[PDB]
């Protein structure tokens, strides 16, 4: 069974930073492209970042360029997301999702980790 478990969310002050982790099990993590999708209170879903199996970012939205970093530690089977200068809009449920070659999109999703931005 494919497992994804995010961690690192919590309360952040306006303009602070966040570092999220997602540890993977049940699959060969090093051969899969990965992504971070955030879900707002409104349940809207938005792609935050994507990375290849090689550790190279393949996507960042321009609404966050300069404040986000997606990384992976293949040996630790962990995916990371760094975000700085958090604003009120960064408040969301952050999910890590595995990228499937046949779907050309997300297959499995973690449980998500919540980031709450406070003034």
């Amino acid at each position: 069974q494919v497992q994804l478990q995010e961690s690192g969310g919590g309360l952040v002050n306006l303009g602070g930073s966040m570092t999220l982790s997602c540890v993977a099990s049940g699959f060969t993590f090093n051969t899969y492209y990965m992504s971070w999708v955030r879900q707002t209170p409104e349940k809207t879903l938005e792609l935050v970042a994507a990375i290849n199996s090689d550790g190279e970012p393949i996507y960042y939205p321009d609404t966050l360029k300069g404040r986000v970093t997606i990384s992976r530690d293949n040996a630790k089977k962990t995916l990371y997301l760094q975000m700085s200068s958090l604003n009120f809009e960064d408040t969301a449920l952050y999910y890590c999702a595995r990228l499937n070659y046949a779907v050309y999109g997300m297959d499995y999703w973690g449980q998500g980790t919540t980031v709450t931005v406070s003034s």
Partner: protein, 113 residues
Amino acid sequence: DIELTQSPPSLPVSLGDQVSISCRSSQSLVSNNRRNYLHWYLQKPGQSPKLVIYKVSNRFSGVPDRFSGSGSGTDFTLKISRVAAEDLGLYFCSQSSHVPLTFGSGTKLEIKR
């Protein structure tokens, strides 16, 4: 980017109903080499999103027989032949034909009051 509009936003149903939900794409999904890369996820209440169907009609791993999908171009449909309690939650269509990958406005399947 590509907007995916889901009709209806909310769908009140009765267990055993046969329902069809819609996802309309703001741009054609046949304009390039990635023809109709339209997928459907179910976000059951309190749980994470699960892949139901990918690439219009393909049932993902673990997807019961009662789910099916159709469409080409800009209008896609997800059909549930007999709604079960396990089918309630938020349905999201998603397209991966164009960059970036985008998600739909959602269709909430809920028990009719």
